[PDB]
């Protein structure tokens, strides 16, 4: 089972630099080219560079010479991409991929991709979120089924992890994308259950914000 694991989200100050990692397993690391791709604001892909770990040979897209530096550690099967002097345009999600094109066969083998690493370039301060339970009053939807909610607001930077009842409750859950306003993000999630389940059995909202080491559980009480 071929896998590529990338490092977690990064908050970087303008003008500094970061080294992203792409740890692979399940295949002979030295025999395949590893490519790095950039994704800005949803749909908008750009090819950065490629490296053949076996020899250290790299090819760069002109736009990225000086911006990106690719390296590979054969002993740990890890590919690295260092981004230098970060600015506005560098905020994006970066993917590494064992693309699969075999130059000598002029054909391809399956492409495997990492999960992506989000890089946020900002000088705004890290702020822990405030988690608020949303119990119905009019958002009861009458009888039959009732929907509860969880409001996570005033945090920086992304991401935040929100689960219901530690992951047990996954059906009928809607988690909305965070929206930035005044240097802070707001996020919300709704859960619809039947009138019989709640209030009878408890529903709890679990929130985690790694950047600030905040972990909070809020029970939805009537």
């Amino acid at each position: 089972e071929m896998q590529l694991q990338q490092s977690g989200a990064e908050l970087l100050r303008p003008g500094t630099s970061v080294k992203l990692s792409c740890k692979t397993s399940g295949y002979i690391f030295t025999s395949y080219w590893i490519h790095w791709v950039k994704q800005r604001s949803g749909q908008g892909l750009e090819w950065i560079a490629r490296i053949y770990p076996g020899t250290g040979s790299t090819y760069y897209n002109e736009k990225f010479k000086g911006k990106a530096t690719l390296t590979a550690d054969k002993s740990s099967s890890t590919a690295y991409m260092q981004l230098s002097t970060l600015k506005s345009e560098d905020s994006a999600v970066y993917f590494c991929t064992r693309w699969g094109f075999i130059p000598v066969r002029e054909d391809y083998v399956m492409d495997y991709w990492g999960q992506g690493t989000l890089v946020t370039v900002s000088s705004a301060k890290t702020t822990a979120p405030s988690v608020y339970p949303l119990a119905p009053v009019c958002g009861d939807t009458t009888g039959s089924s009732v929907t509860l909610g969880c409001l996570v607001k005033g945090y920086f930077p992304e991401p935040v992890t929100l689960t219901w009842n530690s992951g047990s409750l996954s059906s009928g859950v809607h988690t909305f994308p965070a929206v930035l306003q005044s240097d802070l993000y707001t996020l919300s999630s709704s859960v619809t259950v039947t009138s019989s389940t709640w209030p009878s059995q408890s529903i709890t909202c679990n929130v985690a914000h790694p950047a600030s080491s905040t972990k909070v559980d809020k029970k939805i009480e009537p």
Binding site: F101, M110, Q115, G116, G149, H174, P177, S188
Partner: protein
């Protein structure tokens, strides 16, 4: 650099119907060895991109043959013979014939399903929040279709445009509907000075606005 143009930007297709996406290049993609390095990738919501086709028409392993690709020179086409729910996502054509490799802008494929009316739930501020001096009124508009919807907040009869924060989910791969959250934030002081809080929506499924509100008082 080679400019790759994709059309349409978005396509709405019902399950079981065919779909085709176009990709045009500013240079011929015929490489000097006689091969044409044109690939098609699919990026599903919340997933990394995945290659569906290579060399214009060759399918990658594990890709359903309902997907086919064709074209040559500067014009290429990806066709899906019969659309399934799993086809939801953004399709991209990417060329590797000229350096540097360049991508098309993407085509979003969305599942056209029957009209669905939003289920609306409104929530007053929690005690927790009021204690801190803030007050957010939340309105969830769940499982509707089409995505086109307009929400307005009205406090005691007049529209409130400031302090509103909206967010939409992408299309759900289980029922093909969309969901939206709307949060109105005020100070605790101003919240306790008003009475009626109304979340009002406009949607194709109704000739009159879809309403959800509450009156704050005491007891």
């Amino acid at each position: 650099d080679i400019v790759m143009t994709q059309s349409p930007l978005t396509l709405s297709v019902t399950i079981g119907q065919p779909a085709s996406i176009s990709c045009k290049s500013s240079q011929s993609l015929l490489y000097s060895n006689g091969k044409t390095y044109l690939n098609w990738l699919l990026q599903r919501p919340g997933q990394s991109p995945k290659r569906l086709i290579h060399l214009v028409s060759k399918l990658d392993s594990g890709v359903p043959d309902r997907i086919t690709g064709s074209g040559s020179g500067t014009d290429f086409t990806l066709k899906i013979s019969r659309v399934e729910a799993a086809d939801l996502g953004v399709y991209y054509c990417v060329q590797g014939t000229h350096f540097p490799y360049t991508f098309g802008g993407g085509t979003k494929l969305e599942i056209l399903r029957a009209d669905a009316a939003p289920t609306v739930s409104i929530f007053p501020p929690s005690s927790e929040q009021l204690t801190s001096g803030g007050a957010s009124v939340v309105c969830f508009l769940n499982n509707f279709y089409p995505k086109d919807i307009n929400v307005k907040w009205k406090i005691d009869g007049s529209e409130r445009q400031n302090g509103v924060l909206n967010s939409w989910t992408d299309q759900d791969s289980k029922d093909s509907t969309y969901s939206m959250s709307s949060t109105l934030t005020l100070t605790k002081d101003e919240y306790e000075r008003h009475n009626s809080y109304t979340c009002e929506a406009t949607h194709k499924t109704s000739t009159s606005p879809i309403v959800k509100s509450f009156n704050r008082n005491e007891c």
